[PDB]
UniProtKB/TrEMBL annotation, chain G:
<keyword id="KW-0013">ADP-ribosylation</keyword>
<dbReference type="GO" id="GO:0003677">
    <property type="term" value="F:DNA binding"/>
</dbReference>
<dbReference type="GO" id="GO:0005634">
    <property type="term" value="C:nucleus"/>
</dbReference>
<comment type="subunit">
    <text>The nucleosome is a histone octamer containing two molecules each of H2A, H2B, H3 and H4 assembled in one H3-H4 heterotetramer and two H2A-H2B heterodimers. The octamer wraps approximately 147 bp of DNA.</text>
</comment>
<dbReference type="GO" id="GO:0000786">
    <property type="term" value="C:nucleosome"/>
</dbReference>
<keyword id="KW-0158">Chromosome</keyword>
<keyword id="KW-0007">Acetylation</keyword>
<keyword id="KW-0539">Nucleus</keyword>
<keyword id="KW-0488">Methylation</keyword>
<comment type="similarity">
    <text>Belongs to the histone H3 family.</text>
</comment>
<dbReference type="GO" id="GO:0030527">
    <property type="term" value="F:structural constituent of chromatin"/>
</dbReference>
<keyword id="KW-0544">Nucleosome core</keyword>
<dbReference type="GO" id="GO:0046982">
    <property type="term" value="F:protein heterodimerization activity"/>
</dbReference>
<protein>
    <recommendedName>
        <fullName>Histone H3</fullName>
    </recommendedName>
</protein>
<keyword id="KW-0379">Hydroxylation</keyword>
<keyword id="KW-0832">Ubl conjugation</keyword>
<feature type="domain" description="Core Histone H2A/H2B/H3">
    <location>
        <begin position="6"/>
        <end position="93"/>
    </location>
</feature>
Length: 104, 98, 95, 83, 459, 87, 97, 105, 94
DNA sequence: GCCTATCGATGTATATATCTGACACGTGCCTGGAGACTAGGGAGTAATCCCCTTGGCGGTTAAAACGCGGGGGACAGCGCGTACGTGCGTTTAAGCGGTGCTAGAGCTGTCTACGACCAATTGAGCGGCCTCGGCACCGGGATTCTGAT
DNA sequence: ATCAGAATCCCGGTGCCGAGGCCGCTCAATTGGTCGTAGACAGCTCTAGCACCGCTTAAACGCACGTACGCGCTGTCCCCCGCGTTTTAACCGCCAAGGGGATTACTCCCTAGTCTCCAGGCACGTGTCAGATATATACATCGATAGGC
């Protein structure tokens, strides 16, 4: 009976609809808007978690930790574009040394 | 009498600290500095513990990024030692040094 | 005893679709919650402006769609658009 | 109950660790006082805004949310606190 | 005294003198040709040599005719000091000292672009009279030329045309008010449309229109002058399209294939349709890349256009009949293609085109006289005006026109100051194409206009 | 000999003196010859990013003319606010 | 014969153009470039003249600012001649990609 | 007096400002003091710029302000140049400036 | 015939206070009009967030004041806050 | 080897004059801001609870501070030859004034499908509680890099 | 040079406490219904955007020449790095006050809403003088000559 079920989504369409009302984004909200928006948020979540899971497996850890999120983001050009001005706590950096500095 | 030759252990430090995730500034000294700066804007403030951690995480990330751009500016001049003129260039090109 | 809602359970359900054996730590959940909230604000902000520029009172799926295409890079936008129209089609086909 | 001088608590080796994570191989001895200048300017601008939000709320306590909002306003952003 | 040609020229000079004796400007609208230059020279010697007024005269005419105006004056009135203000900025600057600071001229010959750029010098003179040739340029009240020329200090103005009014009443009041604005400014303020009830007086008070114009405009008709009576018979030829251009004509109405991208008929733009359709029926190699190899030479050029297929046959026929011809084109690249065909045929030709210099135009005209050059290649605009081309037997409009009077103006390159022989006019039409629509629309404009312009003095 | 005429590629219409003339306003005294092709690339990247957004506004409104407001909104979204053509 | 020495005329040009307010690129060539790039995004678009003009104002302003930062990089390297490596360094430090 | 601007002693239009806040979706309710405060601030900043532009035009010996004078006014003041740090002004030009290394000797 | 509206006349009346006997070109007037709209949206936008973070329904002058404190540079803010306070305390006395 | 003139060639700033279009200004109109009067719920307030921040103490260690030797990098000086600035004669196409067409932006009028609002009902998801194994950390092995010969 | 010796991985073992499941329940999402307005469609007007010719003239182009700048190489020397020793104070685990943030019940003033009214701001039409354009000055810089000193 839930609108999420009726749409086949995992994310909560009803909650999204309330937030669109309360946020003062516009006078009036159409019935299709929350369904479309929930689908996009679900997609982007799945996109990141897949890469983070691979990084954890490469590191032989069964639980994801913030380091793995940083490695997942900064190695993908399109995620790194989207998150270009975001810092992630306990992230660290990608390993990188300028070739000039290496020994002969 | 054994010694490593200059610049070798400096590379091992780079490989180490790029792999680790820890905070690198000592915590109590940093907290005193935060409280001292706030002392000018209002008297007898109190801080949530996580508020000081948030400030430290943001500040450390800022300086680490600045040293990367500083390193590029030094290499452009065909040097390998960073010097204050490199920082002043980096902050100018960024548009921070208004 | 005071109540505070979050996205946490939905993130965990999606995780178990892509990697059934994997778990996630508490700090990582906080980051994921922040990420979802941040993206929500960006899209809703653009949808609001688009309606205002066109003197339209209602936010509709058209505004969400073109807000998405303004904000996301490259192929990431193309997939996102495909997911949206598919979900709406199912929802309106059902009743 | 009054604080002074402790900008010199940002020690020399602590600054070197930051530069090593940044990939810097050699450091000229003038860099340390230049760095302490830059850090102090950064903190002042963030703390000014965090206090401003705190006063508007009529609170006496600065919170993690006040810091996060201040950073976001400056066009930086910090995931993993508040939010 | 100086020259004599035709008896009606005297009453023209008398009417002109009478209008200036009434102390107003006037319009002369006698038919295309008929020697309006001759009557103008006669007026100048009447002023300078019977009335004995020698105040400076200004003449404006198109670039293609300046040398003819020099020659006719230097032939027929050597007693008038006439000089030409033309050349580079540095040359025209020297002529300020040599002429304008020295005041030894009765007459200046000039052209519109020069008088627009160097206007401030021309403002400095109190002119006796201003003569404007081919005055249709002044039909538009936005034009800077009408503003500047109406501002000059002149005693009187004379406008010359082969046919007044090209479309509509606003052109009339524009031309008319720029001659006497104190009498007619209300017309260009727009009252004349209302007074003549938006031409819904065309037969209800035609006499009102005739009585308005006839005291102020003189116009005499070539059928009324008659005399030598060489005929000007026009024929229209309707022709289809070859398969290549048939594909593209349909594609332009729809969408282009990526085959047409390799042929580069796409990557060219579609934001206007009418132009592209006209090119397609005229010749598909007007599109870039459509000829399959850039080195191509051959009669396939004549097959790719139905027009060229007929024109090749018709030119071969006329050439075998010894008939010389004028070709008028709306488009530059069409003349280029036609000249490629003339080179391929080895035919004898000359060309006049907006890019051709003033000396080259004069040389080409003298070259098309004196010897049997088979064909003249002409732009409809730059080539349409003033010149004697009695050497041709025939005229071809390879492409149609939005205004019929442009074709009449071009056809009047024959017969000015007479012609020895009958002349045929041939019009080529793309059958079942937009070219028929343009032709029918254009004819509709003429069918309105004559009810006005057959009035006036001709009534 | 006359059937057809060559055309230069549109990006090369940003002429060498035009680039020098810009660099002089930037205060540049002396210029190496490689920079002209480098600059053409940078400019082309800039135009693509703005025009792509501008067209996106135009299409959402279902117009066919691109409008000066569309450019202003695109520039503002990318953080390069322009004063003088609208508000 | 007479000549100015190298760089004497360059300094005049700097002082002239910094004083001027003109646009510096020829309008008609720039317009063709804009109308071409648009074809990748939609097959057929009309333009308001003021829309093309706004694009030129933005574009020239962007390039001028880039040359200033480029010049600083060259001076920092103790050159006077700017070179492509200077443009690349500037864009990298500004985070442009 | 009728007009709320004249009760406040302002030149800028308090009523028009109040309308825009209501229509703009900034919040559910707008308190009666907010338009007056906002109008006063906009008027202040307007006066601040125009004074500097007026001086520049007078120094340049011209009686009408033109966009060049606005650019000169903004870029010479440290605070206005910070407030408008990312704005470009049409027909503005730049400040005259040459690095000392480039000057001849 | 389709009616617009703009700040132009109010800008013009302010000009005649700070400098009588001077005028302004229409191009410059357009820039001034654009500037006023920009600053309006910056202030109103931040005031909206301030109300939202504190769960208030109502925008008040206290939100406007704090928005000004955040947006303006360090001394330009002090004069602006004075002008705003002066206007309100006058108005409420009417 | 400066350094001081010298002429003189050139480019830029100045002054006086004429002409023009953009700017201030006045007008008639209308639509949107001011002046009442009303209802009800957002906000201010007093009272209470108890979580969290501040402050202090003692013990142990990790880290910072200090001195030293020496080798590698920053720096200045030099000689070379290339490439890019200045000036000329030739060629091109940008710019402007026309001409003509009609696509498509902008507005009005109608009307019906949609979303806001309401009351009654129900289970999704929240806070509190409990348990087990993924990970940290430790001692001690094997492996692999430096750099002196 | 092949070798010694530091310092990084790799492994098996111990154990702790955070991640994952479960339970009870309450408050917010769902269902079913009415109302009236936003905006979807049809029709119309006429602005202004696209295309071409004709023509002038300043800008762009191609070339020759010479200079001064970019560059590679060298020698000096001083200032940073790598290391051993001594000193400092950060950290951690524990205790204990009480300031302040968070929740509640209550009453009131302020705001949104409605109708009526009329004058502030707009679209328009007009006259004239601030600035643009000419051109005939005046006058500072840049060089070559080449003084001398």
């Amino acid at each position: 009976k839930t609108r999420s079920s009726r749409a086949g989504l995992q994310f909560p369409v009803g909650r999204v609809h309330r937030l669109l009302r309360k946020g003062n984004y516009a006078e009036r909200v159409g019935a299709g808007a929350p369904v479309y928006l929930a689908a996009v948020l679900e997609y982007l979540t799945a996109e990141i978690l897949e890469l983070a899971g691979n990084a954890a497996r490469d590191n032989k850890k069964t639980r994801i930790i913030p380091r793995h999120l940083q490695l997942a983001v900064r190695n993908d050009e399109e995620l790194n574009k989207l998150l270009g001005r975001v810092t992630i706590a306990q992230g660290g950096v990608l390993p990188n040394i300028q070739s000039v500095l290496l020994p002969k | 009498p054994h010694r490593y030759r200059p610049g070798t252990v400096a590379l091992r430090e780079i490989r180490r600290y790029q792999k680790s995730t820890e905070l690198l500034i000592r915590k109590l000294p940093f907290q005193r500095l935060v409280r001292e700066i706030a002392q000018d804007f209002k008297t007898d403030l109190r801080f949530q513990s996580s508020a000081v951690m948030a400030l430290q995480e943001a500040s450390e990330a800022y300086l680490v990024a600045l040293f990367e751009d500083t390193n590029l500016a030094a290499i452009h001049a065909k040097r390998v030692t960073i010097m204050p003129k490199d920082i002043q260039l980096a902050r100018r090109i960024r548009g921070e040094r208004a | 005893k005071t109540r505070k809602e979050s996205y946490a359970i939905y993130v965990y359900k999606v995780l178990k679709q892509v990697h059934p054996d994997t778990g996630i730590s508490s700090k990582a959940m906080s980051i994921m919650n922040s990420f979802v909230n941040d993206v929500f604000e960006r899209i809703a902000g653009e949808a609001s402006r688009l309606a205002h520029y066109n003197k339209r009172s209602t936010i509709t799926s058209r505004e969400i769609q073109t807000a998405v295409r303004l904000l996301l890079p490259g192929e990431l936008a193309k997939h996102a658009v495909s997911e949206g129209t598919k979900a709406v089609t199912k929802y309106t086909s059902a009743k | 109950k009054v604080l002074r001088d402790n900008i010199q608590g940002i020690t020399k080796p602590a600054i070197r660790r930051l530069a090593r994570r940044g990939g810097v191989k050699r450091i000229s001895g003038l860099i340390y006082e230049e760095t302490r200048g830059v850090l102090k300017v950064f903190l002042e601008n963030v703390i000014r805004d965090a206090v401003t939000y705190t006063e508007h709320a009529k609170r006496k306590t600065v919170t993690a949310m006040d810091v996060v909002y201040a950073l976001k306003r400056q066009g930086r952003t910090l995931y993993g606190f508040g939010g | 005294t100086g020259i004599h040609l035709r008896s009606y020229q005297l009453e023209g000079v008398n009417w002109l003198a009478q209008r200036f004796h009434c102390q107003n400007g006037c319009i002369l609208g006698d038919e295309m040709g008929l020697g309006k230059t001759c009557q103008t020279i006669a007026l100048f010697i009447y002023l300078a040599g019977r009335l004995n007024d020698e105040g400076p005269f200004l003449i404006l005419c198109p670039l293609s005719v300046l040398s003819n105006w020099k020659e006719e004056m230097q032939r027929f009135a050597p007693g008038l000091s006439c000089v030409t203000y033309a050349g580079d900025k540095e040359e025209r600057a020297c002529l300020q000292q040599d002429l304008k600071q020295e005041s030894r001229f009765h007459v200046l010959l000039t052209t519109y672009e020069i008088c627009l750029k160097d206007a401030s010098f021309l403002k400095s003179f109190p002119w006796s009279v201003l003569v404007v040739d081919e005055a249709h340029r002044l039909k538009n009240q936005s034009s800077l030329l009408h503003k500047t020329l109406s501002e000059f200090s002149v005693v009187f103005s004379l406008l010359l045309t082969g046919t007044p009014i090209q479309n509509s009443l606003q052109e009339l009041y524009s031309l008319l008010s720029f001659v006497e604005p104190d009498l007619f400014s209300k017309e260009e303020v727009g009252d004349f449309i209302q007074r003549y009830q938006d031409i819904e007086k065309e037969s209800e008070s035609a006499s009102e229109l005739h009585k308005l114009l006839q005291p102020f405009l003189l116009r005499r008709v070539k059928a009324e002058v008659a005399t030598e009576l060489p005929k000007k018979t026009e024929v229209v030829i309707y022709h289809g399209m070859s398969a290549l251009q048939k594909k593209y004509y349909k594609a332009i109405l729809m969408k282009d294939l990526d085959a047409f991208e390799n042929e580069t008929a796409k990557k060219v733009k579609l934001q206007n349709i009418l132009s592209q359709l006209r090119k397609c029926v005229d010749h598909p190699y007007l599109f870039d890349g459509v000829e399959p190899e850039p080195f191509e030479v051959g009669d396939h050029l004549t097959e790719a256009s139905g027009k060229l297929h007929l024109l090749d046959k018709l030119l071969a026929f006329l050439y075998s009949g010894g008939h010389r011809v004028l070709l008028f084109s709306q488009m530059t690249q069409m003349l280029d293609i036609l000249q490629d065909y003339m080179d391929y045929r080895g035919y004898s030709y000359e060309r006049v085109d907006g890019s051709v210099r003033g000396e080259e135009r004069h040389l080409a005209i003298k070259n098309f006289g004196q010897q049997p050059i088979f064909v003249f290649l002409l732009s409809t605009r730059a080539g349409g005006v003033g010149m004697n081309l009695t050497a041709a037997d025939t005229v071809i409009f390879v492409d149609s026109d939005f205004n019929p009077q442009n074709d009449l103006q071009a056809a009047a390159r024959a017969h000015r100051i007479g012609q020895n022989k009958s002349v045929k006019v041939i019009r080529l039409i793309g059958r079942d194409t937009v070219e028929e629509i343009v032709y029918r629309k254009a004819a509709s404009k003429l069918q309105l206009t004559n009810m006005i312009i057959e009035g006036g003095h001709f009534t």
